[PDB]
Write a protein that binds this ligand. Structure first.
Ligand SMILES: Nc1ncnc2c1ncn2[C@@H]1O[C@H](COP(=O)(O)OP(=O)(O)OP(=O)(O)O)[C@@H](O)[C@H]1O
Ligand SMILES: [Mg+2]
Length: 125
């Protein structure tokens, strides 16, 4: 029930309070996304950033939110170190939670944990 523009403000506050530099510049903002898919993305954006704050030990977090072809794509990257096991998608927790909720919406969640942690989340639009 959170607009994505409002969630952006929440994550700026959370990252600043955690002494993590937030890097965001508006580019290709979605011109129309369903209120459902927008709200799913707000929830996933919040969780991606909760994870940065709780686990990463990052000094920087970069967020991109772009309409690309038939998807809205959100990427959240940080320059800390990934703390999870080889398979970090477990029942009852946010990575698998976000992936399952996105996939139900015919979207996707990918993760790269080489240079810190980067989450790419996409949903139809
Ligand atoms: N940005 C990150 N940086 C470092 N480690 C991370 C990051 N995101 C996730 N992890 C690791 O992946 C694990 C699983 O993440 P997940 O969000 O599924 O669970 P959680 O945050 O521990 O619990 P919950 O999401 O239920 O509050 C984390 O416990 C942590 O070890
Ligand atoms: Mg989590």
């Amino acid at each position: 029930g959170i607009r994505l523009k409002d969630e952006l403000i929440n994550i700026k506050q959370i990252l600043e309070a955690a002494d993590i530099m937030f890097i965001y510049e508006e580019e290709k903002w979605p011109e129309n996304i369903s209120l459902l898919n927008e709200n799913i993305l707000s929830m996933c954006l919040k969780e991606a950033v909760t994870n940065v704050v709780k686990h990463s030990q990052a000094k920087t977090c970069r967020v991109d939110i772009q309409q690309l072809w038939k998807e809205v794509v959100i990427t959240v990257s940080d320059d800390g170190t990934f703390k999870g096991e080889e398979n970090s998608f477990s029942k009852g927790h946010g990575l698998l939670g976000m992936r399952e909720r996105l996939e139900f919406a015919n979207g996707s969640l990918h993760i790269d944990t080489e240079n810190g942690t980067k989450l790419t989340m996409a949903i139809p639009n």
